[PDB]
Amino acid sequence: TTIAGVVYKDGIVLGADTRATEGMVVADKNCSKIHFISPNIYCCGAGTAADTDMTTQLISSNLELHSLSTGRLPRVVTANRMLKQMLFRYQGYIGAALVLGGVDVTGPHLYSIYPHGSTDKLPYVTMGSGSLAAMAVFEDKFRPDMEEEEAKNLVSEAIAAGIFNDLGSGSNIDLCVISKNKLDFLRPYTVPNKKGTRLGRYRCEKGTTAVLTEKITPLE
Amino acid sequence: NQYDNDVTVWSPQGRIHQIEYAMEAVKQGSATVGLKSKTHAVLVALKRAQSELAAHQKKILHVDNHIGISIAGLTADARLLCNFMRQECLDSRFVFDRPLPVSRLVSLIGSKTQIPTQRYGRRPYGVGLLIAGYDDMGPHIFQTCPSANYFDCRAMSIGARSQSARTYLERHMSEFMECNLNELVKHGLRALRETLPAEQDLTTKNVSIGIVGKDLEFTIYDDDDVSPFLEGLEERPQ
Amino acid sequence: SSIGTGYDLSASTFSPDGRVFQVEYAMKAVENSSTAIGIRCKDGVVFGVEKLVLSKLYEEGSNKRLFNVDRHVGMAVAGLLADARSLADIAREEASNFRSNFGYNIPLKHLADRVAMYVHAYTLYSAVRPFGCSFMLGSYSVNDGAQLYMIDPSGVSYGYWGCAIGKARQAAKTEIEKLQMKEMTCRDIVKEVAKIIYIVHDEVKDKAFELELSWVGELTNGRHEIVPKDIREEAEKYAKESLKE
Amino acid sequence: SRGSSAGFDRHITIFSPEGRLYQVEYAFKAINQGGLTSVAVRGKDCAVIVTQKKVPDKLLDSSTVTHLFKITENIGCVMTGMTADSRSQVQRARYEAANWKYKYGYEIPVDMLCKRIADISQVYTQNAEMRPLGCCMILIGIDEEQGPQVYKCDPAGYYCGFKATAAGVKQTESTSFLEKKVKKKFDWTFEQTVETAITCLSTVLSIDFKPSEIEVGVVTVENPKFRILTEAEIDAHLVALAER
Amino acid sequence: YDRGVNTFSPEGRLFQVEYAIEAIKLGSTAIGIQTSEGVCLAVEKRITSPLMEPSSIEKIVEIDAHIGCAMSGLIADAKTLIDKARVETQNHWFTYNETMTVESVTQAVSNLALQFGEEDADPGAMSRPFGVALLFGGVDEKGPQLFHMDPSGTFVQCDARAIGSASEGAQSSLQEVYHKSMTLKEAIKSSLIILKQVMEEKLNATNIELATVQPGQNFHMFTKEELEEVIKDI
Amino acid sequence: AERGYSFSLTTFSPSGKLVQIEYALAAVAGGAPSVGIKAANGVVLATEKKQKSILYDERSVHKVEPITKHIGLVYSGMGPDYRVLVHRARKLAQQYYLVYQEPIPTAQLVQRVASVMQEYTQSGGVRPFGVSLLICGWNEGRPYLFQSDPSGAYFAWKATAMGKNYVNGKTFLEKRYNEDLELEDAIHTAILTLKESFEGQMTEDNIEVGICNEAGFRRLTPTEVKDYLAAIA
Amino acid sequence: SYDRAITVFSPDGHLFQVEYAQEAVKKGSTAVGVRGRDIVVLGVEKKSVAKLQDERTVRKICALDDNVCMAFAGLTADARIVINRARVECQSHRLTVEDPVTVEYITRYIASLKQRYTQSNGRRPFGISALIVGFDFDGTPRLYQTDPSGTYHAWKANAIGRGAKSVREFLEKNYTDEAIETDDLTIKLVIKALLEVVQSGGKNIELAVMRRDQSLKILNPEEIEKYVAEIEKEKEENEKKKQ
Amino acid sequence: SRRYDSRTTIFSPEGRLYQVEYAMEAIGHAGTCLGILANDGVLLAAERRNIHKLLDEVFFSEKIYKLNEDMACSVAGITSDANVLTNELRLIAQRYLLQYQEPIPCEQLVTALCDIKQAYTQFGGKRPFGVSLLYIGWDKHYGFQLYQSDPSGNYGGWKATCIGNNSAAAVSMLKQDYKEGEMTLKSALALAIKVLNKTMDVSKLSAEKVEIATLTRENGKTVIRVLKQKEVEQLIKKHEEEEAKAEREK
Numbered sequence A: 001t002t003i004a005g006v007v008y009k010d011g012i013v014l015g016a017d018t019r020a021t022e023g024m025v026v027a028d029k030n031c032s033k034i035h036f037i038s039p040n041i042y043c044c045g046a047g048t049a050a051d052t053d054m055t056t057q058l059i060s061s062n063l064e065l066h067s068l069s070t071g072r073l074p075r076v077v078t079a080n081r082m083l084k085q086m087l088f089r090y091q092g093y094i095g096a097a098l099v100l101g102g103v104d105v106t107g108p109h110l111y112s113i114y115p116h117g118s119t120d121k122l123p124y125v126t127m128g129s130g131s132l133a134a135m136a137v138f139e140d141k142f143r144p145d146m147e148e149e150e151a152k153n154l155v156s157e158a159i160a161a162g163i164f165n166d167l168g169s170g171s172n173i174d175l176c177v178i179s180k181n182k183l184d185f186l187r188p189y190t191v192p193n194k195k196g197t198r199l200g201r202y203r204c205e206k207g208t209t210a211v212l213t214e215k216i217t218p219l220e
Numbered sequence B: 001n002q003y004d005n006d007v008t009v010w011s012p013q014g015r016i017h018q019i020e021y022a023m024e025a026v027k028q029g030s031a032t033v034g035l036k037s038k039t040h041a042v043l044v045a046l047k048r049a050q051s052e053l054a055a056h057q058k059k060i061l062h063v064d065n066h067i068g069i070s071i072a073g074l075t076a077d078a079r080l081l082c083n084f085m086r087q088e089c090l091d092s093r094f095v096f097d098r099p100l101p102v103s104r105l106v107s108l109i110g111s112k113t114q115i116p117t118q119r120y121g122r123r124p125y126g127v128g129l130l131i132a133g134y135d136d137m138g139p140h141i142f143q144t145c146p147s148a149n150y151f152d153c154r155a156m157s158i159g160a161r162s163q164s165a166r167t168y169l170e171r172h173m174s175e176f177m178e179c180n181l182n183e184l185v186k187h188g189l190r191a192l193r194e195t196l197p198a199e200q201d202l203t204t205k206n207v208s209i210g211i212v213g214k215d216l217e218f219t220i221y222d223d224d225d226v227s228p229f230l231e232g233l234e235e236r237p238q
Numbered sequence C: 001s002s003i004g005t006g007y008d009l010s011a012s013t014f015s016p017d018g019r020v021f022q023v024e025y026a027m028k029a030v031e032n033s034s035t036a037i038g039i040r041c042k043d044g045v046v047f048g049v050e051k052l053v054l055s056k057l058y059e060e061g062s063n064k065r066l067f068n069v070d071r072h073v074g075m076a077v078a079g080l081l082a083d084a085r086s087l088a089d090i091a092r093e094e095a096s097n098f099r100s101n102f103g104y105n106i107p108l109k110h111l112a113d114r115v116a117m118y119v120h121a122y123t124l125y126s127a128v129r130p131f132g133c134s135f136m137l138g139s140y141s142v143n144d145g146a147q148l149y150m151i152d153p154s155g156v157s158y159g160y161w162g163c164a165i166g167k168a169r170q171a172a173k174t175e176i177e178k179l180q181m182k183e184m185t186c187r188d189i190v191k192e193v194a195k196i197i198y199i200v201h202d203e204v205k206d207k208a209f210e211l212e213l214s215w216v217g218e219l220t221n222g223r224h225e226i227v228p229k230d231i232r233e234e235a236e237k238y239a240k241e242s243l244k245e
Numbered sequence D: 001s002r003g004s005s006a007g008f009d010r011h012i013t014i015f016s017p018e019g020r021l022y023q024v025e026y027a028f029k030a031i032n033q034g035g036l037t038s039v040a041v042r043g044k045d046c047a048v049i050v051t052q053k054k055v056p057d058k059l060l061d062s063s064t065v066t067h068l069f070k071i072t073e074n075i076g077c078v079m080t081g082m083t084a085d086s087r088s089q090v091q092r093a094r095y096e097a098a099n100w101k102y103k104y105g106y107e108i109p110v111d112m113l114c115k116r117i118a119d120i121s122q123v124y125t126q127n128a129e130m131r132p133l134g135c136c137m138i139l140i141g142i143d144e145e146q147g148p149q150v151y152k153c154d155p156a157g158y159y160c161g162f163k164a165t166a167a168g169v170k171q172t173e174s175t176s177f178l179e180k181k182v183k184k185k186f187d188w189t190f191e192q193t194v195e196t197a198i199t200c201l202s203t204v205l206s207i208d209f210k211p212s213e214i215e216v217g218v219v220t221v222e223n224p225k226f227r228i229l230t231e232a233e234i235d236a237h238l239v240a241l242a243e244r
Numbered sequence E: 001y002d003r004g005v006n007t008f009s010p011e012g013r014l015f016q017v018e019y020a021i022e023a024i025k026l027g028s029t030a031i032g033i034q035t036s037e038g039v040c041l042a043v044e045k046r047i048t049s050p051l052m053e054p055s056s057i058e059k060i061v062e063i064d065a066h067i068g069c070a071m072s073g074l075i076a077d078a079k080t081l082i083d084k085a086r087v088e089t090q091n092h093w094f095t096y097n098e099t100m101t102v103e104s105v106t107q108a109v110s111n112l113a114l115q116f117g118e119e120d121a122d123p124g125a126m127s128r129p130f131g132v133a134l135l136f137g138g139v140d141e142k143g144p145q146l147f148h149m150d151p152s153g154t155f156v157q158c159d160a161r162a163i164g165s166a167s168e169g170a171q172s173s174l175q176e177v178y179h180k181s182m183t184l185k186e187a188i189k190s191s192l193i194i195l196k197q198v199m200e201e202k203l204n205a206t207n208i209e210l211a212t213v214q215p216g217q218n219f220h221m222f223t224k225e226e227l228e229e230v231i232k233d234i
Numbered sequence F: 001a002e003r004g005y006s007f008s009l010t011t012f013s014p015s016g017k018l019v020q021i022e023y024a025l026a027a028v029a030g031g032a033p034s035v036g037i038k039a040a041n042g043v044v045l046a047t048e049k050k051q052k053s054i055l056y057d058e059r060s061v062h063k064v065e066p067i068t069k070h071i072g073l074v075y076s077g078m079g080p081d082y083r084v085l086v087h088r089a090r091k092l093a094q095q096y097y098l099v100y101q102e103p104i105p106t107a108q109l110v111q112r113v114a115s116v117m118q119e120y121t122q123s124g125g126v127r128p129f130g131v132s133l134l135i136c137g138w139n140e141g142r143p144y145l146f147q148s149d150p151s152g153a154y155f156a157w158k159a160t161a162m163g164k165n166y167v168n169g170k171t172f173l174e175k176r177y178n179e180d181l182e183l184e185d186a187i188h189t190a191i192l193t194l195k196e197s198f199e200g201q202m203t204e205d206n207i208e209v210g211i212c213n214e215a216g217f218r219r220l221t222p223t224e225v226k227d228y229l230a231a232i233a
Numbered sequence G: 001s002y003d004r005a006i007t008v009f010s011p012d013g014h015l016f017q018v019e020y021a022q023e024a025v026k027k028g029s030t031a032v033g034v035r036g037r038d039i040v041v042l043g044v045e046k047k048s049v050a051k052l053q054d055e056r057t058v059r060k061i062c063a064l065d066d067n068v069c070m071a072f073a074g075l076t077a078d079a080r081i082v083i084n085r086a087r088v089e090c091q092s093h094r095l096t097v098e099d100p101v102t103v104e105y106i107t108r109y110i111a112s113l114k115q116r117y118t119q120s121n122g123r124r125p126f127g128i129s130a131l132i133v134g135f136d137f138d139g140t141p142r143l144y145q146t147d148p149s150g151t152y153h154a155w156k157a158n159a160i161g162r163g164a165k166s167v168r169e170f171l172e173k174n175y176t177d178e179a180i181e182t183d184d185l186t187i188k189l190v191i192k193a194l195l196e197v198v199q200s201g202g203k204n205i206e207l208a209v210m211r212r213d214q215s216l217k218i219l220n221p222e223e224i225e226k227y228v229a230e231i232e233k234e235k236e237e238n239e240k241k242k243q
Numbered sequence H: 001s002r003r004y005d006s007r008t009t010i011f012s013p014e015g016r017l018y019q020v021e022y023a024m025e026a027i028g029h030a031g032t033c034l035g036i037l038a039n040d041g042v043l044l045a046a047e048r049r050n051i052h053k054l055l056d057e058v059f060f061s062e063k064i065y066k067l068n069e070d071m072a073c074s075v076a077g078i079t080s081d082a083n084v085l086t087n088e089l090r091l092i093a094q095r096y097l098l099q100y101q102e103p104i105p106c107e108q109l110v111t112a113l114c115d116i117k118q119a120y121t122q123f124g125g126k127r128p129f130g131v132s133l134l135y136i137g138w139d140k141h142y143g144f145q146l147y148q149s150d151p152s153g154n155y156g157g158w159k160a161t162c163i164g165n166n167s168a169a170a171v172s173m174l175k176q177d178y179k180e181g182e183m184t185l186k187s188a189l190a191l192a193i194k195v196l197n198k199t200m201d202v203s204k205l206s207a208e209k210v211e212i213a214t215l216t217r218e219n220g221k222t223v224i225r226v227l228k229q230k231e232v233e234q235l236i237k238k239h240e241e242e243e244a245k246a247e248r249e250k
C-alpha cells in the first residue's frame, strides 16, 4: 500500500493507492483504502487488510454511538484515542497502520497511527510499503497553508511515487478532501495505469468443452 | 419480634437481637474458669456428661505450643474457631519462625468473628472462648464473645452459673499475681466449684486442666492426671 | 419522628417521609455508648475516652477505644466496639495502600473521605447493615497542620475544632465551647480533656470508669502516641480536684 | 387508584397500581431532610451557584462545611440533600469525567456528565437491591460553543438543562421567583446573575444573609475555571444589593 | 413467619438444628455397646410391608474394616455422611499408611455439622442440617470405642448408647444392665433384649440387624443363622 | 458490598395476570401523548414536549431520538427508562451493522429491543420498563411504524397513539386519517391529533416532531414546526 | 445464582417440601411392578385416555439401558429429567467401568439425585416416585422403588401413585409362589392388580415386560385384551362356580 | 431480601406448583389456537387478537412461527415469552442440524424446549413462561406430527387438539368430529373452520379474525404455507353452505 495525508489552509487531503497483494501477486487491482469514520473524519488503512477493515469499522461504529449520544460532531482526538488504545491493547498483533484525517470544531487534524499504538500529529504523514517515496515527495514539495487543488496535486503526486517506485503499490489513486464545509470523496481520482488491449481472440466457441454430466434445475 | 431474625437488622433501640441471642449460647454450656499468675496461665474446665454411660465433653483444646483454649457454646463453632487459630499460629511460625503473640491472635479472632455479624444470611459464632497463652509479655487470659468483642483479663469465667466463679475470682485477683502454679490451679478449682450446688463437687471424671507457662508448654490434664490438683483442697462449705 | 411499619427493616428502603431508619438506629447505638471526646489545639490533637469498666476482672487497657490507624493518625471510637475495630482495620489498610501507591503519609482529610465513603457504602443495601459506631480521626503535620475529623454511621465526614460522641455528646460540647483551643497547646489541653470527661461522667448510673488519652502533634514529632502515665495522672488529679466546685 | 398500593410497592422500587414508584418519591422527600436550599442561575457570559451554609457550631472548622464541589477545573457542582450520598455522587461524577477525558481526549460536556449520572441513578430506580440516593445534583460550566451551561439531575433519573433552577426545601417558591424574574428580560451580566441568585435565596428564606451564611460557586466565559467566592467578595455583592 | 436457616432462638440455639434433633425422634431405634472384647451395634429395621425385601434395609454399614456405623432418622441424609467417612478413611490410609482412629473419623464427619446456609455460600452447599444421628463403633489402638453424633455436630464417646424413637427408655434399660466389664455376648444379649422390649413388632431374625467389631476380627455383619442363634437364648 | 436479588419481581396472579407489567402500562398511559403515522412515502413521530416552566431549556433534552441514520424513536411513559432503551437500541443497531455491514431492518431492531424489554419482566430483582416505544424506520423502500409495550410485545401500525387520551387519539386517527397520504399531510394530521389533547397554546416548543422518509430519519427544526403549526404550510 | 433454602425443617421435625412432593406423587397415575422367576413386569394405570392423543408419546415406562427399565408416578416433566440423567449415568458407568450397570447401582444414583435435590439451595424436590426393574448379570431379577425423599428399597412387588395403598394391599394378599410361577401368570397377576383399581377397562392399562437376556418388550392392546380375557375367564370359572 | 421473594419454584401443600397453574390461567385468556393431524398433511388454525383497523400487517403471520424447514409452531399466552421460546427453538433445531447433518426429529425439539421450561419450574426462582405451544411437522421417523406443550414443561403428541380460550368445548367438539385414519387435509380444514366458528366469541367469523397454516409433503420436500384471506373465506362460505343445508331437514 501507499497512503498519505496532508493539511492545507482549508482542511485535509487524504491519498491512497488501490493495490492489494497476497504473496507477490496482485489480488485486488481496485481496493478502497480510504475509510469512513465519521461524516467529518476519514482514515486510510495500510497493512493487514482485514485488520484495517474491522478496526476502522469498529471505531466508526463507536464514534456513531458517541455522536448519537452527544448530539455534536465527533472530534478527531476521539478517533485517535480509540484507535491508539485499542491497537496498543493488542500489542501490535493487529496489523493496522493508519492515516487519520478530519475537520473539527477546532479545525483540521491529521494523525499517523502505528499498529503498536503510537500516534504522531503532523502537518503531513505517509504510511505503507511505499511510504518512503511519498514522504520524499512531501519533504521536497510541501509548504504550509496550501490551496485545495495544490494539496490535491501534492498528495496524488506522493501516492504516484509510491505506485511506480514500490512493488507493493499499484493501480489507481484515491483522494479525499475534507474542509470546514465540504467532503470530496473522489474515488478514481487518477487512473495512471491501464491494462494493455488484447491483441487476439481466445474466445472459446460453444462446444469446445467436453462434458460428462449435465443437470438443469428450474427456479422461480 | 420483627427485629429478631436477621443480624443485619438494627432494633429501634439501637440493638441487634441476633447477636444477643448468639451471646445466650455461651450460657448454655458448662462453666469454665481462666486465671493467670505472673509466670503461668491456667484454664480449669468443668466437663459435662449427658448420661452416666457417656464420657464427659472435651472443653480444653490445644492451639499452639504456647496457646490453649477453653470453649463455651456450640462445639461445631468452637472447632471452627479453634482450627482458625491453629492455622493462624502455623502461618506465623511458617513465615517468621517465631510464635504468634497471643494478643494478635485474639485480634484476628475479633476481625474474623465480626464479619458475619454484618452480612445478610450470615450468623454470629455461637461460642465463647477463654484463651490462655504465654509470650514475651508474660501469661495472658483472653475472652472472646459471639459479639466479636474480646477482653484482656486478669481472671474470667464464662457459662452456666459462672457468676459464682466470677464473684470468687474478683476477691482473689490480688492473690493471683504471686501464687505458685499449684495455688493458682487451686484458686481456679475453687472458682469452678463455686458454680455447683453443695450436693455435688469436683471429681477426676468431670474436671479438665490446661496449663501454659514460662517453664511449660500448653498441657491438658484430664483424668488420673488431675488428682494431684484435686487432692490438696479444702472441704468447702454448705 | 417515629415510624416503623416495615419501612425501618432495611437500608435499601426509604421511609414515606424520606428517612433511612436503619442508619438512625445505628446512630442510636452510638448514642447508648460511653462518651468519647477529642479536641484540636494550635499544635496538635488530643483524644480522651470514658472507657466504662464492666468488671474488675478485666485488665487495665483492655477494650481500647483509642487506636493507631497510622503512625501519624489516631482514632477515637464510640459505640459497637467490634464494628469500630473493623473500621480501624479498613482505615489502616487505606493508609497503607495510599503510602504504597503515592509514596508519602496519607493526608487526614483524604483518609477520612475514603473511610467515610466505605461507611456510606453500607447505608444502601439490604445485604448489609450500617456500622454501629461513630469515630474521630486526629493528626498533625508541619506542611498540613493540626486536623481533627469525625464520621457517623451514615458516612458523613466533617472537620472539627472540638468534638464529642456518645451519651453526653451535647453535655460535653457545651464544656468544650468554653475552651479557647485555637490559642492553647496540647500540653494544657490534656488537663481540660480529662476534666470534661470527669464532668460529663455520671457516677450514679454508670459504675467505675477508666480514662484513655492520646497525643498527636508537634510535641510528638507528628506521631500519634498514648499519653504518658505521668501526664495522665496529672490530668486526672486536675480533673478530680476541679470536680469539687 | 389515586393513592392505592399493593405488595411491597412502598418498600422497594416496583410499580404501584397507578404506575408510580413510591421509593423514588420518598427519595425526593429525603432530599429536603437536609433543611437547605440551593439556587442555580445561568447568565449571558457566566453561570452562578448559591447555597445556604448553616454552621450552627463554633466547634466546626467552617472551611470543611461545603455543598460546592469541583468535579473538574471547568466543571463545578452543588449537591442538595443527604450529605454522604451527595459526596458519593460527587466521587462518581469526578470518576466519569476523568475517565471521559482519558478515553475521548477532550473535556466532558456538562450535558453529558449530568446525563451519565442520571443514567446511573436510573439503575437504582429499576433495581430493588439498592435504594436511590437522597440527593440532587446541579452542574455548571462553560461549553465550547453552547456557552454557559446549568444542568440538574434527580434521584428519579431525570436530568435537564436550565436557564435557572433550585433544589431542596424552598424549591417551588424559588422557581416561581426565578421565572417571574426571567420574564422581565434584563441584561444578564455577571452581577445581575449573582444578585438574582442571592436575592432569590434571600427573599425565599427571608433572612438577608451575612457573608458567612452562604457560599457561591461561579464560572465565567472569560474565566472558565470553577471559582469559589471568598467571604469578602460575597460581602461585596451583599453591600452592593443594599443600595437600590 | 419465615426466617433464615442460620437464625438464633432467644434461648441461644439454632432453630433448624433443634428441629433436626426433633426429626431424629421418628427414626428406627439403635443401640451400641462398648466392651473390652469388642463393640456391638444393633438396630430394628421397621419393615412396613411383607413385600419389602428386608435385606435392602441397611442401617448398619461398614466405614472401614475396623469401623462400623449405625444410623437413625432420615437415612438418605446419612448416606452422604457414610460415603464421606469412607472417603476420609481411605484418604488417610493413602497419605499416612495407617488406619484412622474412631475418634478421628467421628470428628471428620462431625465437621460437616453446621456446614449449611443461604447467602455468601457455594451453589452446591447444604441448605439445611442433616436430620440423622450416628453411632460409630470400632477398634483402634485405644481398643474398642463407641461414639455418638447428632445434627449439632457435638460428638462424644459412650460406653453404651441408644438413639432413635425409643431413646429414653432404651437408655434407662441400658443404664440398668451396664458395667464396664461385660463380655461381648452379654452386650449382644442385652442389646437384643432391650430391642425386643422397645420394638412394636415381634423381634426375629429378619426384623433387625446386629454387627460387631472386635480387636481380633474385622467388621462383621451377623447373618440370619447367627442372629437366630443369639435370639435363641431369649 | 452488593450482589442482587435472583428472584422474579414479576409473577402470575391467580387470575393469570402479570400485574407488574399492567402497572407498567398504567405508568405508560399517564405520560405525555405521542402519535405515529405511516404515510406511503415516509413516517411521522410526534409528541407533547410540554415542560413545566420558562426556566427549562427545551433545546437540551429531546423526546424524539434517532437510533441510526434511518430509524427514530418516541415514547410514552418514564423518561429515564426511555433513555436506557435508546442507548441499548443504538448499541443493538451498531452490532447488527458491524456484523452485516448493512443498516438494520426496522422490524429487527424492534424485535431485539422487544427482547430486551421482555427480559425485565422475568429476570431477577428488576421491574419492567414503564415505557411504550414508537419506532419509525425506512428499510427496503417501504416505510415502517412499530410499537413496543413493557411486556416486550410489539405491533406494526399504520397509525396510532400512546399516552394520555390514547383512545380518543386512536379513534381520531381511525377517522380523520388514511393511506396514500404524503409526508406533509401526515405531519399535519399528526400535529392535529396531538392538538386533540393539547390543553394550552401549542407552540413550536410545546411539541416535538421527527420524520423518517427514504432519505433518512431526522428531527424537525423548531422553525419547520412553526411553519406547520400555523395551521397550514 | 439463586442461593435460597427451599427445603427446610419444620418445628415438628418435618421436611414439608418433600412431603408435598410425595403428595404430588399421590396424584400420579397408578404404577405397579412385580418380580418373577424369569420375567419382570411393570404396568401403569390411568393413562388419561383422550383417544385424540398419541399413546406412544406419553408412555410412563422408559428403558434406561439394555439391562434396566423403569416406570414412574408423579410430575411427568421431572420424570423426564430424572430418566435422562439416569440414562446418561448408565452410559458413563460403561465409560469409566468396562462392566455395564446393576439395578441397585442406578437406583442408588437416582435416589442420591433426589436427596441432593432435597438438600440443595435454590432447588426443589422431584415430584416423582420410581419403580426400577432389571435383570443384572448372575441372572437374579430385581425390582426397586424410590421416593422424593431420596430413600429407596427393594420389593418383590409394589405400587405407587393414585390409590397405591389399595393395590399394595391387593398385592400383599395375592403375591404367592403359585402366582408368578409362569410368565403369563405373573403378567396376569399384574393385570389383575391393575384392574383392582383402574376404572374397569384394559384400554387404560399399559403393561411391559423384561425377560432374561432379551430386550424390553411392550405389550400391544391386543395381547393385553387377550390376557384380560383369560383373567375375566378365570374370574368366571373359579369365582362363578363357587359363589 | 428473603421477604420480597415470591418463591416461584415451590410446592404448594397439596403438592402442586401455583405459578404454573396461574400461567395456565393466563393461557386460558389468550386467543384460541388448535391443530389437526391428517393423512396427507397437518394444520394449525388460530384466533387473531391483533385485529384492529389501524394495524399494518408486515409479517407473514401473527401466531404462526416457522421453526425448521420441516417444522412450524403456533403459540398461546404471553407473546413475548413466546418470542423467546420460539427463538430458542430455532437455535436448538440449528444446533441439531449442525451436529448430525439432518433435520431434528419433532419430538426431540419439543422435549428440548420442555426441559428448559421444566428447569424454570424447578429452580432459579424465576417466573415460568406463560406460553402453551402447538407443534406441527414432518420427519423420517414418524411422518406428520402434532404436539402440545404447557408451561409445566409437560408435553404430548396429539392427533387433534386445541389450546387457548374456550379450549375445553373445542376439545370435546374435536372428539365428536374426529376420524382416526380417515382424516384428509380438506376435511381437517372443514373441522377447523367449524370448531373455530363455534368457539370464537365474536361469531360470523371473517378471514380477518382467524389465521390458518398447513404443512404438507410434496415431491420429496416439505411445504409450509399460510392461507390467504380468500382461501379462508372459501372455507367459511363452504361451512355456511353446509350449515344452512343440514338445517333444511327439519
Ligand SMILES: CC(C)C[C@H](NC(=O)[C@H](CCc1ccccc1)NC(=O)CN1CCOCC1)C(=O)N[C@@H](Cc1ccccc1)C(=O)N[C@@H](CC(C)C)[C@@H](O)[C@H](C)CO
Pocket: A001, A002, A019, A020, A021, A022, A023, A027, A028, A031, A033, A045, A046, A047, A048, A049, A050, A052, A095, A128, A129, A168, A169
Ligand atoms: C488479498 C487481499 C484481499 C488481502 C491480503 N490477505 C492475505 O494475504 C492473507 C493474509 C492473512 C493473515 C493471517 C494472519 C496474519 C496476517 C495476515 N493471506 C490469505 O488469505 C491466504 N494465504 C494463506 C497462506 O498463504 C499465504 C496467504 C492482504 O492482507 N494483503 C495485504 C498485505 C499483507 C500484510 C501482512 C500480512 C499479510 C498481507 C495488503 O494488501 N496491504 C495493503 C493495505 C491494504 C490492503 C489496507 C498494502 O499494504 C499494500 C498493498 C502492500 O501490501
